[PDB]
Design a protein around this nucleic acid. Structure first.
Ligand SMILES: Nc1nc2c(ncn2[C@H]2C[C@H](O)[C@@H](COP(=O)(O)NP(=O)(O)OP(=O)(O)O)O2)c(=O)[nH]1
Ligand SMILES: [K+]
Ligand SMILES: [Mn+2]
Ligand SMILES: [Mn+2]
Length: 328
DNA sequence: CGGCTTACG
DNA sequence: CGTA
DNA sequence: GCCG
């Protein structure tokens, strides 16, 4: 088992679901307390279990696995022996974890904001609604739409959304394309949002595209919120039809020049941990700097041209993983 | 011990 | 600060 | 929290 998540296939569904869930609770709780290193180790240990070919049934099977030390091994041991881990259950029922989880779920609220509200004594969404002076416009939108945004987006929802985005994109710039990215591209059947990547085959024609797209979607009455109600990324709330009604859905739109499209597709397809691990691998093992725009050799001071995700894995000396196997 | 992904709004 |  |  390799140490980096980008060195092994990780399928969406696997054989250690309960074990990985528990470790991810501890990861999430570590992030709520600002311990990014502990969050990373618990996420990586969870991801190792997702990559295993069969269930862990005995503690000895953790021998030699990367990112399993005393703490993660004890969590697994207790789950194997008792079906519950006391530390995990204590986190689950703690007021701090439940409130930080509730608050950071709000669109526009991160750990720092949630933690300040927590320290001020706030605990529920209604507490926030009673103090609208504490809220940015973005947070007001996230709070108002919180119930709809807590409902999973379905794969059936995605196709109808892509068609309306393509229609607006086609009027904004004929020939521009829309690619589904994010978790749905990795094979997920539900999601917290829908992620799209937009480009145009003629380099440079995509400049200034996203404002044109957003103002067309807004004129059609489809945008419940966006930040610009020049930019290349838009995190918005869409109005999506339902039976006899509609529901709010988060949609992320990103524009990239076609020269950068493989890097942007790779970055925005995720998973988040897969990309962190891939960029760490690139820098630490290959001495190359990877981001959503390109791959930089800092010694030659040169960028790698890529025509495909396959190109990028080859540049990094990694076996290619299709999106479905990037579910780290 | 240092390190832990990276850039745009 | 937020977002991905 | 774990790796190198
Ligand atoms: N490098 C990097 N990439 C990131 C980061 N955050 C997001 N991405 C990339 C990788 C992500 O795949 C992509 C957008 O995915 P999401 O919508 O944030 N989540 P997903 O679609 O997996 O699941 P669901 O929506 O159902 O919760 O942006 C980050 O901090 N860093
Ligand atoms: K949030
Ligand atoms: Mn997504
Ligand atoms: Mn997204």
């Amino acid at each position: 088992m390799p140490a980096y998540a980008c060195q092994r296939p990780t399928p969406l569904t696997h054989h250690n679901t309960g074990l990985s869930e528990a470790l991810e609770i501890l990861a999430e709780a570590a992030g709520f307390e600002g311990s990014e290193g502990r969050l990373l180790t618990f996420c990586r240990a969870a991801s190792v279990l997702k990559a295993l070919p069969s269930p862990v049934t005995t503690l000895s099977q953790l021998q030699g696995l990367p990112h399993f030390g005393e703490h993660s091994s004890r969590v697994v041991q207790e789950l194997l022996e008792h079906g519950v881990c006391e530390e995990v259950e204590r986190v689950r029922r703690s007021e701090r974890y439940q409130t930080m989880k509730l608050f950071t779920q709000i669109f526009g609220v991160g750990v720092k904001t949630a933690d300040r509200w927590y320290r001020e004594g706030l605990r529920t969404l209604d507490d926030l609604r009673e103090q609208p002076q504490k809220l940015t416009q973005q947070q007001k939108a996230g709070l108002q739409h919180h119930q709809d945004l807590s409902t999973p987006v379905l794969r059936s929802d995605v196709d109808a959304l892509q068609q309306v985005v393509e229609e607006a994109v086609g009027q904004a710039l004929p020939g521009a394309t829309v690619t589904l990215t994010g978790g749905f591209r990795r094979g997920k059947l539900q999601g917290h949002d829908v992620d799209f990547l937009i480009t145009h085959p003629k380099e440079g024609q995509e400049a200034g595209l996203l404002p044109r797209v957003m103002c067309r979607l807004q004129d059609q009455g489809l945008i419940l919120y966006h930040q610009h109600q020049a930019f290349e990324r838009s995190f918005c709330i869409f109005r999506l039809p339902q039976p006899g009604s509609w529901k709010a859905v988060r949609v992320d739109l990103v524009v990239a020049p076609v020269s950068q499209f493989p890097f942007a597709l790779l970055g925005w397809t995720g998973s988040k941990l897969f990309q962190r691990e891939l960029r760490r691998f690139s820098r630490k093992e290959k001495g190359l700097w990877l981001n959503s725009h390109g791959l930089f050799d800092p010694e030659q001071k040169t960028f790698f041209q890529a025509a495909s995700e396959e190109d990028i894995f080859r540049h990094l000396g990694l076996e290619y993983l299709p999106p479905e196997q990037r579910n780290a």
